[PDB]
Design an enzyme around this catalytic site. Structure first.
Site, PDB file in Angstrom:
ATOM      1  N   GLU A 356      -5.788  -8.182  11.518  1.00  0.00           N
ATOM      2  CA  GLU A 356      -6.908  -8.235   9.633  1.00  0.00           C
ATOM      3  C   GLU A 356      -7.337  -7.649   9.508  1.00  0.00           C
ATOM      4  O   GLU A 356      -7.598  -7.620   8.007  1.00  0.00           O
ATOM      5  CB  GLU A 356      -6.583  -9.720  10.311  1.00  0.00           C
ATOM      6  CG  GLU A 356      -5.429 -10.644  10.369  1.00  0.00           C
ATOM      7  CD  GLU A 356      -4.849 -10.854   8.609  1.00  0.00           C
ATOM      8  OE1 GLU A 356      -5.572 -10.796   7.531  1.00  0.00           O
ATOM      9  OE2 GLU A 356      -3.807 -10.802   9.197  1.00  0.00           O
ATOM     10  N   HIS A 486      13.633 -12.999   1.120  1.00  0.00           N
ATOM     11  CA  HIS A 486      12.756 -11.668  -0.237  1.00  0.00           C
ATOM     12  C   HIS A 486      14.026 -11.734  -1.617  1.00  0.00           C
ATOM     13  O   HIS A 486      13.798 -12.203  -2.736  1.00  0.00           O
ATOM     14  CB  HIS A 486      12.803 -10.329   0.368  1.00  0.00           C
ATOM     15  CG  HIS A 486      11.767 -10.609   1.219  1.00  0.00           C
ATOM     16  ND1 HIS A 486      11.541 -10.978   2.873  1.00  0.00           N
ATOM     17  CD2 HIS A 486      10.487  -9.771   1.325  1.00  0.00           C
ATOM     18  CE1 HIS A 486      10.406 -10.047   2.871  1.00  0.00           C
ATOM     19  NE2 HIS A 486       9.394 -10.067   1.999  1.00  0.00           N
TER      20      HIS A 486
END
Ligand SMILES: *[C@@H]1O[C@H](CO)[C@@H](O)[C@H](O)[C@H]1NC(C)=O
Ligand SMILES: *[C@@H]1O[C@H](CO)[C@@H](O)[C@H](O)[C@H]1NC(C)=O
Ligand SMILES: *[C@@H]1O[C@H](CO)[C@@H](O)[C@H](O)[C@H]1NC(C)=O
Ligand SMILES: *[C@@H]1O[C@H](CO)[C@@H](O)[C@H](O)[C@H]1NC(C)=O
Ligand SMILES: *[C@@H]1O[C@H](CO)[C@@H](O)[C@H](O)[C@H]1NC(C)=O
Ligand SMILES: [Zn+2]
Lengths: 595, 194
Positions: A356, A486
């Site tokens: 991150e 998706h």
């Protein structure tokens, strides 16, 4: 008169009004993700209603120009992105239901329940059904688990997908495009920049050739898992045949991750993991986020502003507040950088912080650029910079210097082989799955696949490319390409194939520059300045330059190279030669449990 | 015998914008510049042509004071020979400036939850500025070849834009207060000095 003057002035007005409203939208989302109340979520609507509405006119008020009367390269790209209208150029009445079908599909996927025999109680995917998806080794229960989800939801969405394809295909013909599949292929297209030309038609060429050199690795990997999976299920796997489609550690079979226990080579030498040693020296959340800097500070990358340490959430709230605990790196804009994560004291959380943190550095490097060119070079660059950082944070040399590992620690080759297989099950066993899904989806969008042969064509390529077969064939009632997150919400999937080949090209140069000898899977880039300054060349360009030029500077090759992904697993490849000699290579498509 | 007049230029409840800055003429006073190091000589104290030390005892005919609020990254344009939106359209300095420029951070006063929309700067002007001049104009910019009739619209933009200032910004978009002191020497008795 001159197009240059009015075009230049228009973007000055846009580049500054955008910042005011973009910052308002981003902060409104941050407040909601930290404070979930009825009133707070209400304030989000206006923040997104004055940005979506604002962007519409500027798309219309920038189409009143013409591209060929601009001679600057940098100034011209900013117009091209802003001229895309989507369905707004078409009539409002024939494209009003196109929105209605799209959001209807996602509603059904969210509301899906699979019961159990005798209907003792109900179950849901999050987290109940996923918990027992592949936690057990009951074949008959596995068969019920797979077809149950395929029957319940895959049947309903079939009419709502042909209308999705037919209605929206004409939208691509409204934006001057051949097929809708090529519209999704336009993120890798660059023109009018000599020796750096990339076309939509070319993206099918390299992908097919790049997978041609990955198959030798996948060919031998299939044999090893098949051989050891025969022990658990001895009656349903032939010595020479395709793997069943319901013994894979997922409802769809994307990641082969939940199979390490059933495929661990050595059960007497544990893999290296430090969670108790960290739990010895009264370790807290802040210390984890402070040693993340020392990796980045000692490689010449900048520090983080003081706003990172006060406005960001780096731990659980500890109060009655309700928040979402999924880690995320935020870029609110105008110099504000934040990170949100429900940090705990574990080894897995140690590496997640490194990932991150890599996103923030990429944002911190191109803030000077215009708003419309403030992003990565292409789709899969942001998740390639932040994945090599976890590779130098799990090495058994970096942890030794950090003091979390004993100075006397021998590196047996059994652990090295044991460690490499775990990585292969995640980043090597998913590449054929993504290629097969996208190749079918490109072809179904083109129109080469007819109405009656949709689902038969789905499983024709499954045997040849990945090598799995369905226990029970279906004709026209089950839509297997409807059970994925998706595929049912109109997203792309090729971002997950480039970022896996792109990271190993970055890792092979940041190690050669740092003057490291030996295999690449024990490479630490810490304390190197020459390598850490080369990364500041790509990271500052953003979207100003074509993605071909960005890759040219870092690796030295203007195309996609797959050899670095074969030098990270070279010691693994040697081992499988000896352990698969008394076994069959490849798989036969004809074999099937038809009767 | 009298306190320095450095009490309204350097200490104000509310400052001014940059497109319409404030000028104060100071003369006939005993002013001590040692106090300048005690309030806020924090971000920058650069000057050229006058030594910042041992030259406080010289005598000049007139002293000029200009104060405004600009962005943090825009303080690099307050210098002779620089270019930018602030330097070419808002506030220009001569090539041989005589005085010290002082800048410091003022986040705690010029920041609000909704943002201080009271600070504005001019974005585009027909021609560059001459040094030491100001413009307070509300007239549409004719970016095209069509008369605007005084009303904005297509190729007709409002020439003044706002400065949204919030405390959660970075140290680049934070509000800063800059006071420019100009030392003038001419053919006249230099009454003001200490
Ligand atoms: C979060 O919401 C609670 C009540 O719902 C409120 O007391 C608290 O001040 C809020 N915190 C923030 C940072 O908005
Ligand atoms: C293109 O735009 C840049 C803006 O920075 C400018 O410096 C350059 O002179 C322009 N090129 C031409 C050929 O006008
Ligand atoms: C840390 O490890 C040492 C090893 O001897 C032990 O003595 C000590 O109690 C540990 N600290 C803890 C468990 O807090
Ligand atoms: C691992 O141990 C030593 C490493 O020097 C070597 O002799 C041995 O062949 C290696 N492989 C195995 C399977 O033990
Ligand atoms: C090498 O890294 C260690 C640990 O980060 C650090 O203490 C040391 O100063 C570094 N050496 C150099 C020459 O940078
Ligand atoms: Zn765009």
């Amino acid at each position: 008169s001159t197009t240059e003057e009015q075009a230049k002035t228009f973007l000055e007005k846009f580049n500054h009004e955008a910042e005011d409203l973009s910052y308002q939208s981003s902060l409104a989302s941050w407040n909601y993700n930290t404070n979930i109340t009825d009133e707070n979520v209400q304030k989000m609507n206006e923040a997104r209603a004055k940005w979506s509405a604002f962007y519409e006119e500027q798309s219309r008020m920038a189409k009143t120009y013409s591209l060929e009367e601009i001679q600057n390269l940098t100034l011209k790209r900013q117009l091209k992105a802003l001229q895309q209208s989507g369905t707004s150029v078409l009539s409002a009445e024939k494209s009003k239901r196109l929105n209605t079908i799209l959001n209807t599909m996602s509603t059904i996927y969210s509301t899906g329940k699979v019961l159990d025999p005798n209907t003792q109680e109900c179950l849901a995917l999050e987290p109940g059904l996923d918990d027992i998806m592949e936690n057990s080794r009951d074949y008959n229960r596995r068969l019920w688990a797979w077809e149950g989800w395929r029957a319940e939801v895959g049947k309903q969405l079939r009419p709502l997908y042909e209308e999705y394809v037919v209605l929206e295909n004409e939208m691509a013909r409204a934006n001057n495009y051949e097929d809708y599949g090529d519209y999704w292929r336009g993120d890798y297209e660059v023109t009018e920049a000599g020796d750096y030309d990339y076309s939509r038609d070319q993206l099918m060429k390299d992908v097919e050739n790049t997978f041609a050199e990955i198959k030798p690795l996948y060919e031998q990997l299939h044999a090893y898992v098949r051989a050891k999976l025969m022990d658990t299920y001895p009656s349903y796997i032939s010595p020479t045949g395709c793997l069943p489609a319901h013994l894979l550690g997922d409802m769809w079979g994307r990641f082969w991750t939940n199979l390490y226990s059933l495929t661990v080579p050595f059960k007497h030498k544990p893999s290296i993991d430090v969670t108790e040693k960290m739990k010895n020296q009264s370790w807290d959340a802040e210390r984890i986020f402070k040693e993340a800097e020392k990796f980045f500070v000692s490689i010449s990358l900048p520090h983080m502003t003081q706003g990172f340490w006060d406005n960001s959430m780096l731990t659980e709230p500890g109060d009655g507040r309700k928040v979402v605990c999924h880690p995320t790196a935020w870029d609110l804009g105008k110099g504000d950088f934040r990170i949100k994560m429900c940090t705990k004291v574990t080894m897995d959380d140690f590496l997640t912080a490194h990932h991150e943190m890599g996103h923030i550095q990429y944002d911190m490097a191109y803030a000077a650029q215009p708003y419309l060119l403030r992003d990565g070079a292409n789709e899969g660059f942001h998740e390639a910079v932040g994945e090599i950082m976890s590779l130098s944070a799990a090495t058994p040399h970096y942890l030794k210097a950090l003091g979390l590992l004993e100075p006397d620690f021998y590196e047996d080759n059994e652990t090295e082989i044991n460690f490499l297989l775990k990585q292969a099950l995640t980043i090597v066993g998913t590449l054929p799955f993504t290629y097969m899904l996208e190749k079918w989806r490109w072809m179904v969008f083109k129109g080469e696949i007819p109405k009656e042969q949709w689902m038969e064509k789905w499983w024709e390529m499954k045997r040849e490319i990945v090598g799995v077969v369905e226990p029970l064939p279906h004709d026209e009632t089950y839509c297997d390409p409807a059970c994925l997150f998706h595929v049912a919400e109109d997203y792309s999937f090729i971002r997950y194939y480039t970022r896996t080949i792109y990271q190993f090209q970055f890792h092979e140069a940041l190690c050669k520059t740092a003057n490291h000898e030996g295999a690449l899977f024990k490479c630490d880039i810490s304390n190197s300045t020459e390598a850490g300054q080369r990364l500041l060349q790509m990271l500052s360009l953003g979207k100003s330059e074509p993605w071909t030029l960005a890759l040219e500077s870092i690796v030295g090759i203007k195309t996609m190279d797959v050899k670095p992904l074969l030098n990270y697993f070279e010691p693994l490849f040697t081992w499988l030669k000896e352990q698969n000699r008394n076994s069959f290579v490849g798989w036969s498509t004809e074999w099937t449990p038809y009767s | 015998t009298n306190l320095c007049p450095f009490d309204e230029v350097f200490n104000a409840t509310r400052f001014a914008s940059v497109y319409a800055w404030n000028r104060k003429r100071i003369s006939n006073c005993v002013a001590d510049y040692s106090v300048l190091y005690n309030f806020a000589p924090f971000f920058a104290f650069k000057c050229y042509g006058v030594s910042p030390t041992k030259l406080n005892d010289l005598c000049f005919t007139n002293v000029y004071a200009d104060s405004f609020v600009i962005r943090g990254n825009e303080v690099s344009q307050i210098a002779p020979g620089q270019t930018g939106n602030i330097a070419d359209y808002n506030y220009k300095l001569p090539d041989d400036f005589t005085g010290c420029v002082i800048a410091w951070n003022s986040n705690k006063l010029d920041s609000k939850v909704g943002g201080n929309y009271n600070y504005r700067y001019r974005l585009f002007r027909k021609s560059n500025l001459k040094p030491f001049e100001r413009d307070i104009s509300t007239e549409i910019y004719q970016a095209g070849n069509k008369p605007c009739n005084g009303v904005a619209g297509v190729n007709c933009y409002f020439p003044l834009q706002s400065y949204g200032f919030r405390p959660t910004y970075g140290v680049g978009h934070q509000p800063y207060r800059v006071v420019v002191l100009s030392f003038e020497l001419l053919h006249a008795p230099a009454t003001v000095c200490g």
